[PDB]
Amino acid sequence: VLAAKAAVSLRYDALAEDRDDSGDIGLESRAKVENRLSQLEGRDLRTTPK
RNA sequence: AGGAUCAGGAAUCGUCACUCUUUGACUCUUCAAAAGAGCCACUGAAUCCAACUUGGUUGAUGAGUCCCAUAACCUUUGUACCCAGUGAGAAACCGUAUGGCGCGAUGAUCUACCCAUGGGUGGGUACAAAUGGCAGUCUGACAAGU
Fold first, then answer.
1. Burial group, residue A32, by CB count within 10 angstroms (0-12, 13-18, 19+)
2. Using CB atoms within 10 A of its CB, is residue A22 exposed (0-12), middle (13-18) or buried (19+)?
3. How far is it between the farthest Cα atoms of chain A?
4. Which of the nucleotides in strand B have any atom less than 7 Å away from a protein CB atom?
5. How far is the CA of A47 from the C1' of B29 (A)?
6. I need a surface site. Which of A11, A23, A41, A45 has the fewest CB within 10 A?
7. What are the CA-CA distances from residue A5 to residues A9, A42, A50 (Å)?
């Protein structure tokens, strides 16, 4: 997921002539990566009985 | 007089924990099945497809980092050795009545084959090194919740 978003982030940094130089797209990526992480730890592989 | 049945020799503790081993129970469980106190109903849970939802090729899932590609094992090219050690043997006079580096243990002396003690070939052992071998640059479509 990071190695995905790294390609979205690095090419935002290595290939943009106009650039804020301010880390937004990387943070827009990292918010979703953290959200995938927070959805991922939400799941549990155990048995949750009622 | 020596031995074995019914004085020459340690063993009188009102337990606390801890660890270890041991067997037994135990929920199970493979060998591997087979038998089922049987049927209804109520109610609960779980699973699986369909469904729907949310996320996703701006990459969902699957995945032996670490057993080190940071390598192992070689392979070729430049050096250090040995079938460091050997250790007593190497060369034949003397400034103006008298004075010494004239060796040497405190070290003199050397560093499997052919060629008259000049040169090297052959094998083991070690390393440096490889844009050398061995040795050929991941997937990609569902996933997850009810």
1. middle
2. exposed
3. 57
4. 44-46, 55-56, 58-61, 140, 144-145
5. 20
6. A45
7. 6, 21, 38
